[PDB]
Write a protein that binds this DNA or RNA. Structure first.
Ligand SMILES: Nc1ncnc2c1ncn2[C@@H]1O[C@H](COP(=O)(O)OP(=O)(O)O)[C@@H](O)[C@H]1O
Ligand SMILES: [Mg+2]
Lengths: 1476, 16
RNA sequence: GAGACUUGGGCAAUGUGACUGCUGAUCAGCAGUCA
RNA sequence: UGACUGCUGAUCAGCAGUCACAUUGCCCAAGUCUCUU
């Protein structure tokens, strides 16, 4: 909408002048200068569309206040087609980065915002001065001296002088202040600072008359008599306020910050103590100036503000102060209103009576104002009034607003016409006259005035510029005009015709106001004459005088890369950086200044320094600038402060705190440099540590390709080659009883079976195995018997025997299984054996050559049974049979024969009255007919168990059915007999449960050898060739089916002779994930691995960086031990495919060793993973390959392959189209999916198992193997031993017995701590809170707590691992987390009375600790273990954490650290070790 | 004085 | 985590007013010395 | 009458300090609501 906004002639001339060269427009307010600025912005639209990098420029528009900025943003948005930006500090631009900055600059062709924000964003090289077309400023008269407008204008000279953007200022009044004398110098200053001449209309006939539709007002002055005498109530109230102030200083409170005057010469009062003085001093002024009724009104506002403060008082002392203030205020209000009510009865017109008494009880100024109000508006329509009221004090606005409300309600006529309202500056006053938050307001007072909802508008000096208000026809001023600019602005508010401009003055000061108003008028006339009659000078681009106006300041320092730091912005930059220091609530975020006397000036600096001042800066102790920065000798104290802050900021940037763009850095920027230092390996996976999006897939799992151990890969025996066979022994480990002989005797038979490999096998550990009837331990022969296959047919027959074993004798077979002929992974063999000559054991050759295929139990009728040869007992003794006539499934071991029992004999039980023969005929004789032999021998038999995974340890006696099962007796000639040796079957029923465990014990041993060799301890006699493996351990801690005792790990740390060989079983324990559900789990080592990893990372970071603050070190440390990082650093090591995670059920979840899928099928599976992932178990089970291809040929038929491919392609669109099948078919193809959590857990488990045996020092080498703590190649030994012997620096080279002053009576600390410090620097550094300015010889506690946390955590975890051997790891982690809790640390700290010796100055936390310690004493130092106190103070646990590290670093003896930790944790540890 | 002096019921809005 | 508004704290910036300290100029008088 | 000192007042300029008032801005952080993990 611009057609109705058509410009005027003077606007055109002004735009034309400002386009050619820079200048400052000067017209009376309401002339549309902002519209001129809009047109100027439009005149630069030639390059607003092009991007910055291609030469496109963006318009810049800046204003002094946020409200004017918002109004102009709306105006330009409605009056231009450009996308209008908004760049202010009230919208949260504090934490922006280059991304949204760049995209906002790209998208917004014009930018609007405040001055400081634009200064900051142009100094920090977001946009260069060469990147802009035109910059428009408004209210330039504020921009003088050190105002941000002048600072922004300074940057034009410091940058590229050519291709410099146009700049123009907007103003209606050009000079601010009473120094208007000799207007010429200020005119030159403003025309040179903005490098532009000032222009104004110059012909009253055509320009001034036209623009004077913004008509000047009519001056009116009303005089009132002086106050002849003061009242009794005022002086009585002042006398009360006297003793009130006296008691305010008498009132003692806690320590408060120190405030001094602006020149650092006078001692001020704390702000919270001076606010009440300021409030009462304003109230007294209100009383003495505007009348007693005004004071009655304002005491209500005092009540309101004091009630708000009392509600919001953080400390009880502040609450007491504000309560005393409220009591005094209420007493004052009652005493004051007593006088009002003693005379508010002079006449019977009630509300008009109130009006008359207000008239009576009003000062002559306010009385005259009320008469003017009554006689001015003539009781016209309420919409006929547009008036403004200006008073100096903010509270005077609300006071006279309440007075106007009451008086108008008291008026008969003005009641219906007038409605008041008050506003103040941005430091808004509580608009309510009652308790806080009467209502949720939603309409601003300016909006009320614009909408016509109000006609009177009480205001302070906030309503002269910026706010767009309709032209008022009345203006009233209650206080004398102070400044020329305020006069010009206030008289400019009355813009409509016949407007009334009224100002009130006293009688005997009337003439002074007369002279000052004529001087203001004469000054305006002189300005007009100077502009009109000046010589026809150019724009005045005189660089000599421009430079001569600026050099007085310190030279603006610009660093490399084009960034610049303004010395006038130095204070703001330094304070902004200093606030970023981590604190509790305050933490001394302000730099403590101090000016030096002349003696120090001529002691330190040059001879010239007697007159010029020198100031010293003391940075907060939580900053590495422990020393002081000295100011340059400067003319006055203010410039000396500027120089000191500027030099300190330059030093801080030299130490890297300020970034490339002079903004203080945070964790996001701190980790950017460290990214490629410790997290380089993430790049091979594509992502990075700083990439937060990399954590989006933290919870998902990952797939891996498993592989057999090297001992199994290509271990198939070959014909005519050396091959080793290992004999397997299954020793029973229980007392034999009648319910156990059937397996006890058979398992101990000298006959057995051997596992045969071409390769050699290392010595393996003893396995626990749990049968349902006893406990089994299985061993493998150390010396493998060696034979060479002389006949390929013998090897073939062995191979079909091995296949037949799993196919039939255990039924561990699927129709898609194919005998794995090829020599590859898991291609070993199982061979039965029999006794040979002497102790030598040889092949049971008849056994394999007889049982090529399992005999079939043919159902034989009596017609057929009568012609087979008769049964003969030794042919059945020790054999396996099957009760086919009852159930054609069960195997049945023949333990003995009853030659004394016959079918004619009476049954032993359950049919004792009757016999076997007719019993069989009753139920099974119907289908089988008669039986051949009526009077022959019987056989007593026992059945084999059907269990298949003998890991669980539950045990019991099945007396309900075992007695009936053990007595099962069958007819010999009825049940089919396989004549197979029952001992061999009874041994091989356990075979897969042994093969699976060996398949991982090999991995454990092969990894242990590698780890030992890398540590270069494999030559030690306990390791290497002479290693004797130990039997595994049962985990009974699990439930799933005087002097402190020296800590073993630390004891073996110092003494290398206490080391012990690493067990294969201990590695296997860390290999088996808890999902596999074995007898032992890896979670017991995982917690110690985590503790040691955190400790080592913390120490490595502390040694690497002793300067950075504890926050960035803590977050980096938490990033290092992050589970995703452990995943990424363990994938490379090829550990995950070595792990043990899944359940072992051979029928459904395990693959036989010597049997695999067809080779072509596997090739197809691994060629197309997308085609492979859509194949389920049923698709494989569809075919049933014949004996030839499956067994001898070792492949599948071509037509069978066709059926596979056709079925898979059909299932690609079948009911299972798109479904996932990898969750169950991966076990047949050597693939597995493992959680990343398990990967991190097993990394930590390996670290823990290494630590608990090899000591702390050796494990640091292993961290090098995992490339976590990258070795400093210059000094590698610092990663080996100095990691626990480092951490300090030259800070200890300065010392004095003055430290005893800070450590008041530390002998009691030694007595209640036990430790005796060799150096007191550590204890002092631990005891200093960052909110402590008194001390500078030492540092804060943060960079000690960083190490103390890790040390305490590691020692606690080690102790709970060692001593607590009968409790679950899942609760062990909870116990550890409870022992490291901050509340427990605070309780320990306060029990020994360590709160007294803390060094800190912060009232709120001091009161927090005070309210904590008394409660804890009320608990008798026995915290229920947590006590529901008010709030735990973090500092009490923090100082204990720091003291732990200080005690350790004093002597470097971890044993001493454990001693003191146990001494301070004894009762809590004893309580927690009993119950978590 | 114990009271405010009642200003004149009339006064002039003089022109400067 | 973000957007709106309010609460709370700290620093910087412009200007006026009051009192003090010091320098320079101008005007004036007195007292004292020389010419 | 001049030179000059002593005393003291007045005017004016400039600088610096104390106290108070007014307006403007940035930063940290809290509350609730909504978007929403
Ligand atoms: N030439 C013009 N054409 C259309 N409208 C104008 C013109 N000049 C002034 N105005 C209107 O008068 C108003 C003047 O307000 P403002 O711009 O704040 O005045 P100033 O900037 O002089 O204080 C604007 O809102 C504008 O819409
Ligand atoms: Mg305006």
């Amino acid at each position: 909408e611009d057609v109705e906004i058509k410009p005027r002639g003077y606007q055109l001339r002004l735009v034309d002048h400002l386009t050619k060269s820079n200048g400052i427009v000067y017209l009376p307010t309401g002339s549309g200068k902002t519209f001129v600025a809009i047109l100027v912005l439009k005149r630069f639209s030639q390059d607003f569309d092009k991007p910055i990098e291609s030469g496109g420029k963006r318009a810049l528009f800046m204003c002094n206040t946020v409200e004017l900025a918002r109004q102009q943003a709306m105006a330009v948005r409605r009056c231009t087609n450009f996308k209008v930006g908004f760049y202010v500090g009230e919208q949260g631009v504090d934490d922006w980065t280059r991304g949204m900055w760049s995209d906002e600059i790209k998208k917004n062709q014009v930018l609007v915002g405040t001055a400081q924000v634009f200064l900051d964003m142009v100094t920090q090289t977001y946009v260069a001065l060469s990147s802009l077309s035109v910059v428009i400023i408004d209210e330039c008269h504020h921009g003088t001296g050190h105002h941000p407008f002048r600072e922004f204008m300074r940057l034009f000279t410091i940058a590229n002088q050519t291709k410099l953007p146009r700049v123009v200022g907007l103003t209606g009044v050009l000079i601010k202040g009473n120094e208007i004398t000799n207007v010429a110098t200020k005119l030159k200053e403003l025309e040179i600072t903005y490098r532009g001449n000032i222009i104004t209309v110059s012909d009253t006939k055509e320009m001034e008359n036209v623009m004077l539709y913004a008509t000047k007002p009519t001056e009116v002055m009303v005089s009132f008599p002086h106050q002849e005498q003061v009242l009794t109530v005022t002086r009585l109230i002042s006398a009360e306020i006297e003793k009130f102030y006296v008691s305010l200083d008498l009132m003692n409170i806690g320590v408060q910050p120190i405030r001094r005057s602006k020149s650092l010469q006078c001692l001020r009062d704390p702000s919270k103590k001076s606010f009440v003085k300021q409030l009462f001093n304003d109230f007294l002024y209100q009383m003495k100036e505007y009348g007693i009724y005004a004071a009655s009104i304002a005491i209500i506002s005092l009540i309101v503000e004091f009630d708000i403060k009392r509600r919001q008082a953080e400390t009880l002392s502040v609450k007491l102060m504000h309560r005393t203030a409220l009591t005094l205020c209420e007493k004052i209000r009652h005493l004051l209103v007593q006088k009002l009510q003693d005379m508010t009865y002079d006449d019977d017109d009630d509300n008009v009576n109130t009006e008359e008494v207000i008239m009576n009880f009003s000062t002559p100024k306010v009385q005259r104002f009320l008469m003017s109000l009554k006689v001015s508006f003539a009781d016209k329509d309420p919409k006929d009034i547009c008036c403004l009221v200006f008073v100096e004090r903010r509270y005077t606005c609300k006071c006279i607003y309440g007075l106007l409300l009451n008086y108008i309600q008291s008026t008969p006529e003005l009641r219906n016409v007038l409605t008041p309202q008050f506003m103040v500056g941005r430091n808004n006053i509580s608009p309510d006259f009652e308790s806080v938050l009467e209502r949720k307001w939603q309409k601003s007072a300016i909006q009320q005035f614009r909408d016509g909802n109000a006609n009177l508008m009480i205001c302070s000096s906030v309503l002269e510029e910026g706010i767009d208000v309709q032209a008022c026809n009345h203006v009233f001023i209650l206080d004398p005009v102070k400044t020329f600019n305020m006069y010009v602005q206030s008289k400019g508010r009355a813009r409509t015709t016949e407007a009334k401009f009224v100002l009130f003055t006293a009688d005997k000061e009337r003439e002074k106001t007369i002279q000052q108003i004529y001087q203001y008028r004469k000054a305006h006339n002189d300005i007009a004459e100077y502009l009109k009659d000046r010589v026809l000078e150019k724009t005045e681009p005189e660089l000599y005088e421009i430079k001569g106006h600026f050099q007085d300041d310190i030279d603006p320092f610009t660093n490399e890369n084009g960034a610049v730091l303004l010395p006038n912005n130095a204070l703001a930059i330094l304070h902004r950086y200093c606030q970023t220091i981590p604190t509790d609530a305050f933490g001394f975020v302000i730099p403590w200044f101090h000016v030096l006397q002349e003696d120090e000036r001529d002691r330190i600096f040059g001879v010239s320094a007697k007159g010029k001042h020198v100031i010293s800066i003391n940075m907060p102790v939580n900053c590495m600038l422990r020393d002081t920065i000295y100011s340059d000798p400067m003319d006055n104290v203010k410039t000396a402060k500027i120089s000191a802050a500027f030099k300190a900021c330059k030093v801080l940037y030299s130490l890297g705190e300020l970034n490339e763009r002079f903004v203080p850095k945070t964790l996001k920027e701190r980790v950017a440099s460290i990214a490629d230092v410790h997290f380089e390996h993430w790049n091979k996976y594509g992502d990075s540590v700083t990439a937060t999006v990399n954590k989006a897939d933290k919870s998902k799992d990952r797939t891996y390709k498993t592989e057999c151990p090297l001992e199994f890969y290509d271990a198939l025996p070959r014909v005519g080659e050396i091959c080793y066979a290992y004999e397997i022994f299954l020793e029973p480990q229980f007392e034999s009883c009648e319910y156990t002989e059937h397996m006890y005797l058979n398992l101990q038979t000298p006959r057995n079976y051997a596992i045969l490999l071409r390769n050699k096998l290392p010595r393996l550990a003893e396995m626990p195995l749990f049968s349902n009837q006893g406990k089994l331990h299985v061993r493998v022969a150390n010396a493998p018997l060696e034979v060479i296959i002389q006949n390929s047919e013998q090897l073939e027959l062995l191979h079909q025997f091995h296949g037949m074993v799993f196919r039939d004798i255990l039924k561990i077979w699927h129709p898609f299984f194919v005998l794995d002929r090829r020599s590859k992974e898991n291609s070993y063999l199982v061979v039965p054996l029999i006794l040979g000559a002497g102790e030598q054991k040889c092949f049971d050759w008849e056994l394999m050559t007889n049982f090529r295929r399992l005999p079939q139990s043919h159902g034989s009728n009596v017609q057929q049974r009568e012609q087979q040869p008769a049964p003969r007992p030794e042919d059945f003794e020790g054999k396996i049979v099957t009760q086919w006539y009852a159930n054609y499934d069960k195997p049945m071991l023949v333990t003995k024969v009853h030659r004394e029992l016959t079918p004619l004999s009476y049954m032993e039980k359950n049919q004792q009255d009757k016999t076997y023969y007719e019993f069989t005929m009753s139920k099974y004789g119907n289908r089988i007919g008669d039986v051949v032999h009526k009077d022959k021998f019987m056989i007593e038999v026992r059945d084999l168990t059907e269990q298949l995974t003998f890991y669980v340890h539950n045990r019991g006696k099945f007396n309900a059915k075992s007695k009936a099962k053990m007595k099962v007796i069958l007819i010999p000639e009825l049940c089919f007999n396989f004549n197979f040796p029952g001992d061999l079957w009874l041994k091989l029923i356990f075979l897969p449960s042994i093969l699976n465990r060996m398949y991982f014990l090999l991995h454990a041993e092969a990894l242990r050898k590698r780890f030992n060799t890398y540590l270069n301890l494999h030559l030690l006699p306990f390791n290497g060739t002479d290693y004797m493996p130990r039997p595994l351990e049962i985990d009974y801690s699990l439930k799933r089916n005087g002097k402190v005792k020296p800590l073993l790990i630390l004891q073996k740390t110092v003494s290398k002779e206490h080391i012990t060989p690493a067990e294969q079983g201990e590695f296997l324990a860390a290999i088996t994930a808890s999902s596999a559900a074995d007898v032992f789990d890896m979670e017991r080592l995982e917690i110690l691995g985590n503790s040691f990893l955190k400790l080592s990372a913390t120490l490595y970071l502390a040694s690497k960086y002793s300067d950075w603050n504890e926050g960035t070190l803590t977050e980096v440390k938490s990033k290092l031990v992050s589970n995703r990082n452990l995943l990424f650093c363990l994938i490379d090591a090829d550990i995950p495919k070595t792990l043990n995670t899944i359940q072992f059920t051979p029928r459904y979840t395990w693959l036989p060793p010597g049997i695999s899928l067809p080779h072509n099928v596997l090739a197809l599976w691994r060629e197309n993973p997308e085609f492979a992932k859509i194949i389920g178990p049923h698709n494989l089970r569809d075919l049933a390959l014949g004996d030839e291809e499956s067994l001898v040929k070792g492949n599948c038929s071509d037509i069978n392959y066709n059926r596979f491919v056709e079925g898979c392609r059909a299932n690609g669109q079948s009911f299972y189209a798109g479904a996932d099948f990898s969750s169950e078919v991966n076990f047949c193809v050597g693939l597995v999916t493992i959680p990343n959590k398990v990967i991190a857990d097993t990394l930590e488990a390996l670290l823990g198992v290494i630590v608990k045996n090899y000591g702390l020092q050796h494990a640091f080498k292993m961290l090098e193997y995992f490339k976590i703590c990258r070795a400093d190649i210059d000094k590698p030994l610092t990663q080996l031993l100095n990691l626990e012997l480092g951490g300090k620096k030259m800070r200890a080279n300065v010392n004095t017995t003055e430290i005893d002053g800070f450590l008041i009576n530390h002998y009691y600390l030694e007595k209640n701590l036990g430790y005796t410090f060799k150096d007191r620097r550590y204890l002092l550094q631990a005891l200093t809170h960052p909110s402590y300015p008194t001390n500078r010889i030492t540092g804060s506690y943060q960079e000690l707590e960083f190490i103390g946390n890790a040390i305490l955590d590691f020692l606690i975890s080690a102790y709970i691992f060692e001593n607590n051997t009968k409790m679950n790891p899942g609760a062990l982690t909870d116990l550890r987390s409870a022992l490291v809790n901050n509340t427990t640390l605070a309780c320990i700290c306060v029990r020994h009375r360590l709160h007294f010796f803390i060094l800190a100055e912060n009232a709120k936390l001091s009161e927090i600790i005070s309210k904590f310690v008394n409660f804890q004493e009320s608990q008798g130092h026995r915290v229920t273990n947590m006590s529901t106190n008010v709030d735990v103070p973090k500092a009490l646990g923090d100082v204990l954490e720091a003291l732990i590290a200080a005690v350790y670093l004093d002597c470097r003896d971890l044993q001493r650290t454990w001693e003191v930790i146990f001494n301070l944790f004894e009762p809590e540890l004893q309580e927690f070790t009993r119950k978590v | 004085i114990d009271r405010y002096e009642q200003v004149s019921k009339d006064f002039e809005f003089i022109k400067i």
